[model samples]
Target: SIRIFPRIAGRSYIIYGQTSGIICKRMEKSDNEFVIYNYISEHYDKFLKKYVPKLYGKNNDMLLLEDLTYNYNNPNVMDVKIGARKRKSHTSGFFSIRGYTNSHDYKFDPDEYLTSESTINHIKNFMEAGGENRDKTKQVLLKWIMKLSELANDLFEINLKFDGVSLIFIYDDDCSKCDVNVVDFSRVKLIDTNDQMTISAVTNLIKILSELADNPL
Candidate 1:
């Protein structure tokens, strides 16, 4: 049996070598983790690549992916997991879905993550990089929340929730949220029974978005 989470260098996505265990696909005589990532990049919105770590190319069995945990140090961040995220014990022993909530912890410290100076600098850099100004940026930001709704629903149909998910609020103006992303897909899976965990998870995401719509992030 494989361990749930991979041993990291520290608290980062420093995955070394071609790997796929419980955190990803099950190992067998042949496991193609690359294929799954490729499938998602191809079928899923290529733009979502923005939320995940950057694949810096394969160095033999080892691959390079930039750590986006800081997510550009944004304050408008929402990380979520959709499925049986907790561990369980049964007649056979213990097992559980390993992703999302089980993986990352969110810190409600926007005051520190995105201070006034940081916010201004980020907005400045974003506009300089040809990103939309505040209004359009806010629209695009919330667009991501609904976008996840669509993507997750599609994944459910195909038996994959892209489970280990997160939405990092990267940039925010007093009026609205400016930048956010949907992160994590390694724990994507096909549950055999009615996956209520996934159902509630998605519902919570929608509700979160709805509530945020009323207030400024």
Candidate 2:
């Protein structure tokens, strides 16, 4: 059996199949996602394992990836769009949502850029959704920020530029378990020049998260 995946952000055509552990993403003929996956899988697979999902298979029209939320019990997930040149509608301080299991009242527009304050509030909401305390929420967010910082550094060193990719954040209810992964590689490409957009965008995210972690309201 197969079913359409819910809360998907950009490239909104992914499906969960009978495998339960894998997700199938439909892609265009010109999309470079599969190529980038293979490249990373072949070389930096082990090192990048913590930041990226494992590739299960790829065909001409569809690619399979490890289901990021399959192991969680009521996962609270967020997709933060990375890179300054990301999309025409997305700005520097905003992120897109792929939907959260616990957040039903939160309405969002996929084509809009959220304010800095709203983004922080949503993050706080996301962290505490599992009934976690504010202190624990701050700590959890801090840990994620550090990991994302490390991933950003590694990507810079690799000379890879991800134009339309996003940072996917996931945490189980109760906030005891959480993870962050880089996803959406259709616009990934190698660059001979510097990837300043990625660096700038992540740096901004770190600043936002750092302040929030230090001073939660």
Candidate 3:
């Protein structure tokens, strides 16, 4: 099974949460939707080759995306310290989804994960620590920084040469507002060894999804 979230021009567009089912079902019945879907279905080979030629040349598909824990697996999970204080988890598990599958099989701990209030507090603490000097401090916030770095590296590995893309959509508590973003791996900074594996997996997954979306077997 595959889960798809609609995005527009790389940005996450708002889909009515309560009425999404109706909209999706309606789209399935619409003539325009069928036309677009059929065009993608029948002309996938041509479309992919034209828009994502690199993928065809590589002859690769199917992604093996890893979990955040796997990507940033460091035994030394410690608090980030500067001067005499520690920085907190700014957005812990903020991107976690309820049922998305990936390399890791870990479950989300809602109680442990950072909430909006906690995230805001972390930001406040960060600002109070070194408002202007925050940039320098950020450079050494190993735990947090490394996680982001790993994510970027993983994304780049999947999208750059693999001709794939990853989407990260963050929604507000009410699910009314959302920030949708696409990660094109080619533009990400490459670092950390595991990131390579993570990227390769994600790339394969994207390619496979692209194929399924177009071919619909």
Candidate 4:
């Protein structure tokens, strides 16, 4: 029942709700934030592929991010939270599914991502339609995990999604929808590509999917 007003992002700055009163958010500086913030600006399209909202502008006091929800309110969106903590300085012993940071109130139940009772009966049917009769050894989810690992190749930590900031699941209960947004560039850096770190990107996603495959909420 959670719906972000203006049907987009809420809280312009430190304040909450959607309004045009020149509100401002205080950006907390992190150790490596500068590098990736700058990196996104320079290579926005190539790497992020418009998955992230554009940095409208910034100064010492305030800044702006392109409001994505203004034009989008995908009814079929979900995010996987492989991250254990927020902002900077993370602990790696956890995983979850969460709401988009930009539209914190734009609520979709975490169970819907894996369950069949609420909004995902169609997914269950889709999965069952194939069944064991097709003779495919790998379940549909593992492929999703591997694809997730490949999609967000360089990025790790923060609010990273497998498909993009926004994941779309169309054809469920005969409906169509979309919503979008990205982050956690603070710890970003150059490297030979961390194998352990790269897989860590989809760790939470893999964990949840496995649990769902076995339990089927």
Best by TM-score: 2
Q: Which candidate is the best by lDDT?
A: 2
Cα lDDT listed for each candidate: 0.40, 0.71, 0.28, 0.39
- Minimum summed lDDT over a 10-residue window in model 2 is located at 91-100
What would you estimate as the lDDT of candidate 1?
Answer: 0.40
Candidate 2 lDDT tens digits, 69-163: 99988777877777444437554343354444445466654555667777766666666675647777776677888897897677666667777
- Residue-level lDDT for 88 in candidate 4: 31
Tens digits of lDDT, candidate 1, 125-207 = 33233243534554644675666566446444443444434444343333244444444444555444444455555555555
Output the lDDT of residue 137, model 3. Answer: 30
Residue 63 of model 1, lDDT score: 42
lDDT of 4: 0.39
Candidate 1: clashing residue pairs, number:
3
Clashing pairs in 1: 76-169, 77-169, 78-167
List of clashing residue pairs for candidate 2: 130-174
Model 3 regions more than 4 Å off: 1-194
lDDT of 3 by residue, 170-212 (tens): 2222222222223323222223333443343334323332332
Preferred candidate (TM-score higher): 3 or 4: 4
Off by over 4 Å in 2: 29-31, 84-89, 92-104
Please say which candidate is ahead in lDDT: 2 or 4: 2
